[PDB]
Amino acid sequence: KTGGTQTDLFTCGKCKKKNCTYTQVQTRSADEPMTTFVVCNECGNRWKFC
């Protein structure tokens, strides 16, 4: 009950598995382009990629 998709491109930094979700948002406006964040659906370890 969050707003992301199961992608499994990056591993977590704890559970060391492949069940991470990512979202592609672009901070303030849709003309100030994308940022890719990756969040583990398992323990909740999150980091970014861009």
Name the binding residues for Zn(2+). 12, 15, 40, 43
Q: Of 48, 46, 49, whose CA–CA distance to 15 is shortest?
A: 46
Which lies closer to Zn ion via its Cβ, residue 2 or residue 29? 2
Burial letters 10-43, b for 16+ CB under 10 A, else e: eebeeeeeeebbbeeeeeeeeeeeeeeebbbbee
Least Å from the CB of residue 4 to Zn ion: 14
CB of 29 to Zn ion, least distance (A): 31
Residues that bind Zn ion (CB under 5 A): 12, 14-15, 40, 42-43, 45
State the binding site: 12, 15, 40, 43
